[PDB]
Write a protein that binds this DNA or RNA. Structure first.
Ligand SMILES: [Mg+2]
Ligand SMILES: [Mg+2]
Ligand SMILES: [Mg+2]
Ligand SMILES: [Mg+2]
Ligand SMILES: [Mg+2]
Ligand SMILES: [Mg+2]
Ligand SMILES: [Mg+2]
Ligand SMILES: [Mg+2]
Ligand SMILES: [Mg+2]
Ligand SMILES: [Mg+2]
Ligand SMILES: [Mg+2]
Lengths: 85, 68, 96, 210
RNA sequence: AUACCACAAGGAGUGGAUUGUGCGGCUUAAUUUGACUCAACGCGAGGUAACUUACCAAUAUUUUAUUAUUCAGAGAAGAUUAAUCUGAGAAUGAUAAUAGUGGUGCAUGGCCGUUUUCAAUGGAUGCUGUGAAGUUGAUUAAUUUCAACAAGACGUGAGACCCUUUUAUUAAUAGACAGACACAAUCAGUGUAGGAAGGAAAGGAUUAAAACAGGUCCGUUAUGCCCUCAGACAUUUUGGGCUGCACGCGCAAUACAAUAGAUAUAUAAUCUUUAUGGGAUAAUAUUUUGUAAGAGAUAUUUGAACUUGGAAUUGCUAGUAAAUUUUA
């Protein structure tokens, strides 16, 4: 249930670096991109059912890596068909 | 052997959600000439779009919270 | 210029000594060697994750070796050696 | 007292950063990790068995890991340098030898076949002895354990600690969890590359009169 | 054969009183729960109030996917304190993921404990039999080293190795070996002498094969099956509990006094010459920590039992037992 403004704030970070660090605090916001931390984790959990990203949880921390099906999908989302300069 | 708690009291009801229809159109008036007569007040940092929340002793901004 | 060596094993602090003693004392300036006695951390803990059997305890430890040099020199004479004699596992925090 | 407090904190970083590689790098088989922290690029060094897959592909795995390690340690990016190397001998790495049993047990090959293959590899490698133990639900309701010993192995004292290499892995299955333990006894070499350089105190050789 | 978790020679106890703690029963709305000879009972590193917390009495808030139906920008679902912004999903179904200190340690892993201050154990050569199979004395903590022997050699465990204290001095290195002499053989054991140290220098740590339906699902994003699905067997808030009182038991702290008490200059001087020993219980007043005291500290008063304990039983051989102090 996140807005479209912050949902593109997530997909823009995945095209550059491909990785994201999430903590496990239940009443905080992420410093890199301002989303409530319980809502941001539920966003990543819905991305896994499409298969675009795989996760790893160790020592109260999340480490997520997108796959080739996600990195194909994510740069296609922000894609402009033609650019005239 | 935990079980379901059966409560002899019924559920206390929650207040129902309300929403006033065409709440944004109240702030403008339409003349017979076709021109718009503006009655509500727009806050000075956000004069373009937002209106000030009309309280008796206070004027309130919904974006920045400026108080007057 | 108080400069120190702090390690975790004995064998690393030894090979840094005869490399530094020949390069610093014999060439430019004088120095002083100073070794500090060791500092030991103790965490006595119970072994089993239960309270059933015969209660035994275990003592864990961690040791720090400290050797300090006290040098008074010119400016670049010590600072050329920091770039030259940087060894791999040891830390050497230099206080100019 | 203050200088003791710093060395503890960098080790709790090391415990968390080790178990990431045991979850993320099953495909290429890392042997170990090493961390250098007191240089201006803080150095993460990885010994993987198969580095030719990574640098040959030039994927994001060199770069995706590089973003996480700095953002975990709150350092900015392009301040960490990750160096990749090879492993010398695949037989002496017990993490890779136990990982192969995790692959082979999933193809319904029986445990007597899978344990018999790992003893043959180290006999070609040159280790003196190994020990593999299987334990759990092997044939039904009751549980047991079976161990398969090859060669000689020493398990007492400090000179045991320089000459063994052990690891515990588990395999999940549809009924219960099965534990897998593997030990490898390293042979002597006085170069220091393959094994420990120092000699056993039991064995005493006498020079000839000549 | 062997042994202070067995006696013997010895010495301090316990069981007898008071109190702090853990177990059993009982009571109540709830007094959450695992463990029961060595091998359960100051044990879960479980020490007094909210959390911890699983119990009772009440309140408030909700993860995802495929797909069915009805909504929804002529503004879903939110945030704020009825009117102000932001704005695109929502409501009920069904499968499939997610959650539970809810059950099963007689369905498992891992980590442990007990046997165990036990000493045994594996190929290869030869010999005996059709075959399964098999190869006395001394001494040592130890199938640990000898001697005789159809057996001759090897490997694992023990040992060797590692950490602490002690003498010295370049502070990381020497120093001890049963070395020396004596006690008729080898392997040993005992006594004297020199030495900081004489017999494993003293004390620890590591630690075979194998066994137990030993304990641990209430440490774990370790897990199979089962059970539960939104005032949830989820999670949050406020009070009450785990500590209650007829009564049985285990582990401990002060005592029953001149080998003592008060005072002090700590042998200046003085007093008590038998209940001025003993401190439980309780009152009034000042006060510390905490959101919150039947919680800790100070002044004065009240002053219980108790005059060495029945049957029985635990530990201990040198700077040991016993007594008095000291950090985390
Ligand atoms: Mg050995
Ligand atoms: Mg040993
Ligand atoms: Mg008594
Ligand atoms: Mg409570
Ligand atoms: Mg659970
Ligand atoms: Mg059991
Ligand atoms: Mg049982
Ligand atoms: Mg509930
Ligand atoms: Mg619950
Ligand atoms: Mg005591
Ligand atoms: Mg008195």
């Amino acid at each position: 249930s996140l807005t479209n403004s912050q949902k593109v704030a997530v997909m823009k970070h995945f095209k550059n670096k491909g990785s994201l660090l999430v903590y496990d605090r239940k009443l905080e916001k992420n410093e890199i991109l301002d989303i409530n931390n319980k809502k941001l984790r539920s966003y990543i959990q819905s991305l896994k059912d499409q298969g675009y990203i795989e996760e790893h949880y160790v020592w109260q921390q999340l480490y997520c890596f997108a796959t080739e099906s996600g990195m194909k999908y994510f740069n296609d989302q922000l894609e402009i068909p033609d650019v005239i300069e | 052997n935990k079980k379901k708690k059966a409560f002899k009291t019924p559920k206390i009801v929650k207040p129902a959600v309300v929403k006033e229809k065409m709440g944004w159109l109240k702030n403008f008036r339409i003349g017979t000439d076709g021109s718009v007569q503006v009655i509500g007040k727009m806050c000075e940092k956000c004069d373009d779009c937002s209106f000030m929340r009309n309280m008796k002793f206070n004027y309130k901004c919904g974006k920045c919270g400026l108080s007057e | 210029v108080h400069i120190d060596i702090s390690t975790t094993n004995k064998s690393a602090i030894t090979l840094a000594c005869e490399k530094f003693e020949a390069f610093a004392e014999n060439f430019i300036e004088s120095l002083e060697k100073e070794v500090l006695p060791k500092q030991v951390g103790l965490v006595p803990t119970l072994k089993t994750p239960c309270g059933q059997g015969t209660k035994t305890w275990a003592k864990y430890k961690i040791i720090v070796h400290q050797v300090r040099y006290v040098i008074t020199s010119s400016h670049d004479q010590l600072e050329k050696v920091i770039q030259f004699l940087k060894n791999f596992p040891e830390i050497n925090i230099n206080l100019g | 007292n203050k200088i003791l407090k710093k060395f503890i904190a960098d080790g709790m970083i090391f415990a968390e950063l080790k178990e990431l590689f045991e979850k993320c790098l099953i495909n290429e088989g890392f042997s170990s990790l090493e961390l250098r922290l007191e240089e201006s690029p803080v150095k993460v060094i990885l010994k993987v068995v198969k580095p030719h897959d990574l640098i040959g592909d030039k994927k994001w795995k060199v770069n995706q890991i590089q973003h996480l390690v700095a953002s975990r340690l709150s350092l900015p990016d392009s301040n960490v340098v990750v160096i990749i190397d090879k492993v010398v001998e695949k037989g002496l790495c017990p993490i890779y030898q136990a990982n192969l049993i995790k692959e082979k047990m999933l193809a319904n090959i029986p445990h007597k076949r899978a344990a018999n293959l790992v003893l043959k590899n180290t006999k070609f490698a040159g280790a003196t002895g190994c020990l593999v133990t299987i334990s759990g639900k092997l044939k039904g309701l009751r549980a047991c354990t079976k161990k398969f010993l090859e060669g000689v192995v020493i398990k007492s004292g400090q000179p045991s600690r320089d000459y063994v290499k052990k690891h515990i892995t588990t395999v999940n299955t549809k009924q219960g969890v099965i534990g897998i333990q593997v030990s490898i006894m390293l042979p002597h070499d006085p170069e220091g590359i393959i094994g420990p350089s120092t000699l056993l105190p039991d064995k005493i050789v006498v020079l000839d009169a000549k």
